[PDB]
Amino acid sequence: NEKLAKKKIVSIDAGRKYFSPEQLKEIIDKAKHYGYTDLHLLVGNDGLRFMLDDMSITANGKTYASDDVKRAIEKGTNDYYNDPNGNHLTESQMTDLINYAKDKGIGLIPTVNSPGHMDAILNAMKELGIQNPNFSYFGKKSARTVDLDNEQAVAFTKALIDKYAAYFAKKTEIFNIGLDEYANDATDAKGWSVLQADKYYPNEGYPVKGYEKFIAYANDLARIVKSHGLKPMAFNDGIYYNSDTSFGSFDKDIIVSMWTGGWGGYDVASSKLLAEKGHQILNTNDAWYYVLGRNADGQGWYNLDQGLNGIKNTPITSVPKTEGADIPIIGGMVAAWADTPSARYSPSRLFKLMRHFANANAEYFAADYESAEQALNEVPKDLNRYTAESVTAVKEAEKAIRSLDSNLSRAQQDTIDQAIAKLQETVNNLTLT
Numbered sequence: 001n002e003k004l005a006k007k008k009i010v011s012i013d014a015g016r017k018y019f020s021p022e023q024l025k026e027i028i029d030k031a032k033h034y035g036y037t038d039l040h041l042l043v044g045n046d047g048l049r050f051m052l053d054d055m056s057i058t059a060n061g062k063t064y065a066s067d068d069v070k071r072a073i074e075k076g077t078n079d080y081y082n083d084p085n086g087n088h089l090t091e092s093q094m095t096d097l098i099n100y101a102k103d104k105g106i107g108l109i110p111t112v113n114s115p116g117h118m119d120a121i122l123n124a125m126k127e128l129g130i131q132n133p134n135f136s137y138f139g140k141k142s143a144r145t146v147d148l149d150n151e152q153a154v155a156f157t158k159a160l161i162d163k164y165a166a167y168f169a170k171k172t173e174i175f176n177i178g179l180d181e182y183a184n185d186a187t188d189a190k191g192w193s194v195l196q197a198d199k200y201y202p203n204e205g206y207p208v209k210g211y212e213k214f215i216a217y218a219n220d221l222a223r224i225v226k227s228h229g230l231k232p233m234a235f236n237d238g239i240y241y242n243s244d245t246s247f248g249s250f251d252k253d254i255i256v257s258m259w260t261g262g263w264g265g266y267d268v269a270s271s272k273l274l275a276e277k278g279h280q281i282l283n284t285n286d287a288w289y290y291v292l293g294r295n296a297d298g299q300g301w302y303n304l305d306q307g308l309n310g311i312k313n314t315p316i317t318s319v320p321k322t323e324g325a326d327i328p329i330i331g332g333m334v335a336a337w338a339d340t341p342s343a344r345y346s347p348s349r350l351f352k353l354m355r356h357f358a359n360a361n362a363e364y365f366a367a368d369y370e371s372a373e374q375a376l377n378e379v380p381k382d383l384n385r386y387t388a389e390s391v392t393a394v395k396e397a398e399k400a401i402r403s404l405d406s407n408l409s410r411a412q413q414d415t416i417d418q419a420i421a422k423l424q425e426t427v428n429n430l431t432l433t
């Protein structure tokens with residue numbers, strides 16, 4: 001029961017790349033079928049591909065008009081990637097999508113990423129007329145990351161997150177504020193080091209109070225999200241980067257999506273340290289990542305074969321960087337990404353990844369009762385014209401299906417399937433008096 005109670009989530013990068021309501025519905029269908037609990041839909045991730053009906057934003061002592069914010073975001077997204085399939089989901093489409101998922105017992109968790117992976121928002125701010133929103137590192141400007149010294153750019157971004165969080169209030173549980181990979185383009189993936197550097201290496205031109213300002217920013221977004229009754233979530237890499245607790249403390253109410261154990265020269269906090277600090281953890285192990293278009297061995301990092309191997313070899317309970325500690329989890333999340341958003345989206349490949357994650361951790365995933373429900377619906381309603389003996393058999397087989405534990409896992413699917421087969425057999429054996 002502890003296993004089935006955890007979240008099982010599929011994540012889809014619909015920030016970089018357009019996904020239609022139809023495509024997303026198909027993903028929800030498969031998520032439900034395979035025993036998942038939630039769809040994690042990035043809508044702000046480099047591109048920004050979700051537009052509310054009212055996008056007016058009040059910040060910087062004015063209001064930026066809804067139609068101007070919309071045009072600025074559409075344009076800004078296209079400058080990142082002008083997807084021939086579409087630009088953004090509308091509010092009507094999102095509301096319907098959330099309802100469609102809810103009716104299948106699937107939750108939706110959105111991400112609108114900042115202060116990194118926000119290319120489109122930075123573009124949109126410039127189109128509105130806000131100056132120099134981008135972070136720069138010794139003359140190299142980030143296309144993805146806002147400068148936390150820029151009060152006007154920061155105020156706008158916070159007000160945009162508030163606007164989205166207000167929409168998602170009461171229709172979702174968790175809002176992912178992201179926070180991953182600060183200035184990864186401008187700093188060669190050393191952005192957290194750069195933000196912390198001035199404290200330890202002063203008078204060398206590193207950003208003054210960089211990391212301290214990042215903690216304040218993260219905590220302000222957390223406050224914003226919490227005000228709407230949503231649980232804030234964020235990726236782990238910048239949270240106590242280098243295990244450094246001396247700059248300040250992160251809001252404990254931020255759920256940590258633990259996706260990386262770090263790499264050479266990129267020393268992230270262990271999941272042990274994060275749990276000890278009082279954060280709940282969603283295991284988002286990059287062992288299971290799939291980047292669209294990288295479809296076989298040799299086709300690059302996070303290719304489909306690598307992800308399928310990661311799923312086979314790294315269970316849902318194996319969290320990045322545990323230090324050998326027992327790390328509790330709220331659930332696990334397998335993620336598909338669109339780093340090259342011109343890549344073809346292949347539903348079958350995504351569904352293979354999803355199916356493998358479910359099968360490899362089958363005790364955690366809900367069983368499928370849909371065919372059992374259908375089988376019961378197909379039983380002839382009136383049995384009077386059949387022999388007592390053949391009728392009793394059908395009634396007992398029906399009882400057997402209705403008696404199944406309603407909380408079986410995917411590991412126990414055969415119990416359900418055998419019960420369906422028995423009912424079908426007894427119905428075919430009904431004999432006219």
Ligand SMILES: CC(=O)N[C@H]1/C(=N/O)O[C@H](CO)[C@@H](O)[C@@H]1O
Nearest residue numbers: 096097098099100101102103104
């Ligand atoms: C908003 C919406 O379309 N809801 C439908 C639905 N959402 O998943 O599928 C159910 C069947 O599974 C239908 O009974 C619901 O009417």
Ligand SMILES: CC(=O)N[C@H]1/C(=N/O)O[C@H](CO)[C@@H](O)[C@@H]1O
Nearest residue numbers: 180235259289291302337338339
């Ligand atoms: C939290 C996270 O996963 N961040 C990035 C990532 N960094 O290595 O890997 C993915 C796959 O390349 C990218 O799509 C993500 O934007």
Ligand SMILES: [Mg+2]
Nearest residue numbers: 079080123143
């Ligand atoms: Mg650009």
Ligand SMILES: [Mg+2]
Nearest residue numbers: 376377378381
């Ligand atoms: Mg009926």
